[PDB]
Each structure stands twice: as C-alpha cells, then as structure tokens.
Amino acid sequence: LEPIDYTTHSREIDAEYLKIVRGSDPDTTWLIISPNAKKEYEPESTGSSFHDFLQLFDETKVQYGLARVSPPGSDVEKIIIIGWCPDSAPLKTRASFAANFAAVANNLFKGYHVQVTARDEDDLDENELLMKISNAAGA
C-alpha cells in the first residue's frame, strides 16, 4: 500500500511531540501533522487551546493530531491522538489509513491515553472527547 512518511521531518515532528507529551511549554499543548506536496508528513499547526485543535483539521487530507489535555474535574493531564481520515482525502491514502494510524500510534506519538478515529467535525465534539479522556486508562 502507501506507507506513511514521518521520518523525513522527524526533527520538526519529535520537537513538538516531546514538548506536548511532557507539558514543558503551555503555549504548545497540541500538534497536527499533515502531508506536504511530496507526501511527507510534517508539523502543520500547533496551539495551546484544545478547542482550537479540534477545529484545525483539513477535510481534504489524512492527518494526525496529538494533544495534551486535562478535562475539567481534575488536574491530571492526558494524551489523546486523533487519526483524521476525511472522505475527501485521496483514495489511496484513505485505504492506507488503518495501517498508517497504527504506525503513528506505535512508533511516533507513543504514550497516548486515548485514540480516536475522526472523519468530520461531528467526530471531534469537545465534550465527548473530554469525557473519553477522563475515563481513560494508563498510557
């Protein structure tokens, strides 16, 4: 199939990844990686607000998001990863999504507490996710 490439820009990716999973920078609590013109994945956007995160996915591309969140109700911070696979994304990339999301979860964005598959904004309702995060088990 069409394997994902997240090692070419591993430098840029890992830099944001560590910041987020460690919580070492309040300005950066989430990251979305998207494929460039050469089909290489690199950081597309980062931000501090989880609410902004959920609204920053591209409906024409398969992307992966990573966010460190603390649901209202506790001070525990947990990690959620999102496999964004919109209908409009290129056929071949959508067909390789299940395989590539698994790769991202096992090799790139390791240490997540919650894993979600999304296709559109309805799959990214903030309250629904804050609930999943709150009911999550260990990393």
The CB density around residue 17, as the number of other CB atoms within 10 Å, is 19
112 CB contacts (<8 Å, ≥6 apart)?
66, 79, 80, 81, 105, 139
The CA distance from 15 to 83, in Å, is 20
Could you give the number of structural domains in the chain?
Answer: 1
The CA distance from 26 to 107, in Å, is 25
Local structure of residue 105 (DSSP, 8 states) = I
Provide the H-helix boundaries in 23-111.
50-54, 91-95, 97-103
User: Do residues 119 and 82 touch, judged by C-beta distance below 8 A?
Assistant: no
CA neighbor of 82 nearest in space, from 135, 56, 5: 56
Local structure of residue 82 (DSSP, 8 states) = E
Q: What is the CATH number of the domain that holds 27?
A: 3.40.20.10
Residue type, 121: E
Backbone interruptions in the chain following residues (C to N > 2.5 Å): none
User: Do residues 19 and 25 touch, judged by C-beta distance below 8 A?
Assistant: yes
**For residues 20-32, b (16+ Cβ closer than 10 Å) or e, as one string?**
bbeeeeeebbbbb
Q: Record the resolution, in angstroms.
A: 2.1
Experiment used for this model = X-ray
User: Do residues 45 and 56 touch, judged by C-beta distance below 8 A?
Assistant: yes
The CA distance from 13 to 49, in Å, is 19
Domain that holds residue 14: 1-139
